[PDB]
């Protein structure tokens, strides 16, 4: 039921990089099918378009994998993926992330090499995520009697097919579409170039920071609400 949000940048913004005709099918074909299938599957269900993010969580059904889940996750994944890239790209994180990756992944140089290796090692079609970890299990003894600041850290999670860290109660910050359709059309099968160009020419740290300044706001209330 949800409308397909166009990417917040012109379709011809990264021609010296991944071309528009690739995007004409990655967004105009792949993403259109994902959203329209949801419109054909959420016609009269119990949800009928409550909120897109919780639909993936609701359709997750704790691993039961309802049929609408795959299109729902892909719709959010690609939509989240479009925001992750701006025409400028590259650069380095600005302050807010720097206090984290340095204390979690040693250094930015260590992190980027680790991030590229994780995405490259991702076998088959899937997604690689850099997600803030603010997990809260709905089970006995889940709450830590002595919470610590370093307990909620940044983790690099590689997920197959269509599954996002939202099902782990994590808050994704950035992701790379390691599905072959995202990168196979232009530079053949060189996923390494796809990962390199994504990190050095396409990452939007400011967008990640905006999606990170929200991360420790959903996290900023859990410890004080109780």
């Amino acid at each position: 039921g949800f409308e397909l949000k166009p990417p917040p940048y012109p379709l011809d913004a990264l021609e010296p990089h991944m071309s528009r005709e690739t995007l004409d099918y990655h967004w105009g074909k792949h993403h259109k099918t994902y959203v329209e299938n949801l419109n054909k599957q959420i016609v009269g269900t119990d949800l009928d378009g409550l909120s897109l993010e919780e639909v993936v969580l609701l359709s997750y059904n704790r691993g039961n994998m309802l049929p609408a889940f795959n299109n729902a996750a892909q719709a959010w994944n690609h939509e989240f993926f479009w925001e992750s890239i701006q025409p400028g790209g590259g650069g380095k994180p600005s302050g807010d992330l720097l206090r984290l990756i340095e204390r979690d992944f040693g250094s930015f140089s260590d992190f980027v090499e680790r991030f590229k290796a994780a995405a490259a090692s991702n076998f088959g079609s899937g997604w690689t995520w850099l997600a803030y970890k603010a997990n809260r299990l709905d089970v006995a003894n889940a709450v830590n009697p002595l919470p610590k600041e370093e307990d909620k850290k940044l983790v690099i999670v590689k997920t197959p097919n269509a599954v996002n860290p939202l099902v782990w109660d994590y808050s994704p910050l950035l992701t790379i579409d390691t599905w072959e359709h995202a990168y196979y059309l232009d530079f053949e099968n060189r996923r390494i170039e796809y990962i390199n160009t994504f990190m050095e020419k396409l990452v939007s740290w400011e967008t990640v920071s905006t999606r990170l300044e929200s991360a420790m706001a959903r996290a900023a209330q859990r410890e004080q609400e109780g």
Binding site: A140, N141, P145, L146
Partner: protein, 402 residues
């Protein structure tokens, strides 16, 4: 009645269809013999079907401010021993809602009974502190333990340099059927109970093959044991009657057969049968279907070598030279040997192979070799027409069974 454990068998003259279509009873239109193939029945011991399968050799037999001293653990707890007096049954079992401590309060709120551990695991035991009235001291409280399997109480002692302290624990020893997912093993405290597990830090015949088959009328495979008490060897006799830069022919490997791209199979077929040709042949390999074996050997350099392409010639890998095959392996089957005794056939007690050879004991031919034959003991029972055979084919009968 059967005089030995074994499996039912009849060659013929017994109605395959039962008398009624719910019973293991068969009628004989003609008189015939019912054979009981002797076999050890190990039905008195547990059989693990994941490890015990057909034709397995069995070299081994089958099986068969004192508060801070307490502790709240998983479905158990310890308490100091002598105002929290302890009440216990004669043998000691707290079924449900039973009290184990009252703590009579003279003032008529509760004093802590545990060191308030920082992690509250989801235990089945529930502790409740019911306050009674006794009139209608009067508000003497009580300690009630409840679960949702039986608790057991037995005091443990901490010996150290002579001095002694008593400690009563109350476990939740269950039926052991719920002890899945070994994490959930109160046996983590079971060793301090009546257990004798070695810490591997200070601890420092029967034969027979498995004759197991699935009788679908039982939905459970039945087991027989074939050993030296059932199968015996008949004495040796002559029953098999047989009908160039090269070395003598010797039985051995020819080398790995590479796959043929014309047949696009990773492991080459190398052979069709009568059914296969009229079922699997792509109307293009007919030119290659030969009735005679043609052997080709290639080297690491890709060169194709055959020697004479008219006779069965192969290379011996161990001695690295060519030699002839035995009989050219013609497509049409021809009799090479002819054994007097065929495999799987039965005979009675006094059948004679020849004049010199002694008589053959009753049984079924189980193993056929070049000279000797191994027989599985069988006991034929003569049955007249109109008799009723109890049991389906290959059904296990024990001693005394009708």
């Amino acid at each position: 009645y059967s005089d030995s454990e074994g499996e039912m068998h009849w060659s013929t003259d017994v109605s395959h269809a039962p008398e009624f279509t719910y019973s293991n009873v068969h009628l004989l239109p003609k008189t015939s013999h019912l054979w009981i193939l002797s076999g050890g029945s190990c039905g008195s011991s547990l059989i693990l079907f994941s490890i015990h399968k057909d034709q397995d050799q069995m070299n081994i037999p089958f099986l068969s401010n004192s508060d801070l001293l307490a502790k709240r653990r998983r479905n158990r707890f310890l308490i100091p021993f002598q105002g929290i007096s302890v009440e216990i049954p004669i043998n000691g079992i707290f079924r449900r809602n039973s009290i184990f401590a009252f703590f009579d309060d003279p003032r008529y709120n509760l004093a802590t009974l545990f060191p308030k551990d920082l992690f509250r695991e989801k235990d089945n035991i529930q502790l409740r502190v019911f306050n009674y009235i006794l009139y209608g001291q009067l508000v003497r409280t009580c300690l009630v333990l409840n679960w949702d399997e039986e608790v057991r109480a037995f005091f443990v002692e901490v010996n150290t340099k002579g001095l002694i302290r008593d400690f009563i624990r109350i476990g939740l020893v269950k039926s052991h059927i719920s002890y899945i997912r070994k994490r959930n093993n109160p046996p983590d405290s079971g060793l301090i109970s009546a257990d004798s597990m070695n810490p591997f830090y200070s601890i420092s015949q029967n034969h027979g093959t498995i004759r197991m088959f699935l009788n679908r009328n039982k939905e459970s495979q039945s087991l027989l044991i074939l050993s030296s008490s059932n199968c015996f060897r008949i004495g040796p006799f002559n029953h098999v009657k047989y009908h160039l830069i090269t070395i003598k022919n010797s039985s051995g490997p020819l080398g790995t057969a590479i796959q043929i791209s014309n047949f696009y199979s990773f492991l080459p077929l190398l052979t069709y049968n009568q059914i296969s040709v009229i079922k699997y042949l792509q109307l293009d390999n007919f030119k290659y279907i030969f009735q005679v074996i043609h052997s080709y050997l290639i080297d690491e350099n890709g060169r194709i070598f055959n020697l004479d392409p008219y006779s069965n010639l192969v290379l011996n890998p161990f001695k690295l030279n060519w030699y002839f095959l035995h009989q050219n392996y013609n497509n049409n089957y021809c009799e090479e040997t002819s054994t007097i005794i065929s495999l799987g056939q039965f005979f009675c007690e006094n059948v004679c192979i020849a004049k010199k050879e002694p008589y053959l004991k009753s049984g079924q031919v189980l193993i056929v070799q070049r000279d000797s034959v191994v027989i599985r003991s069988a006991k034929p029972y003569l049955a007249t027409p109109g008799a009723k055979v109890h049991g389906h084919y290959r059904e296990i009968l024990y001693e005394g069974d009708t």
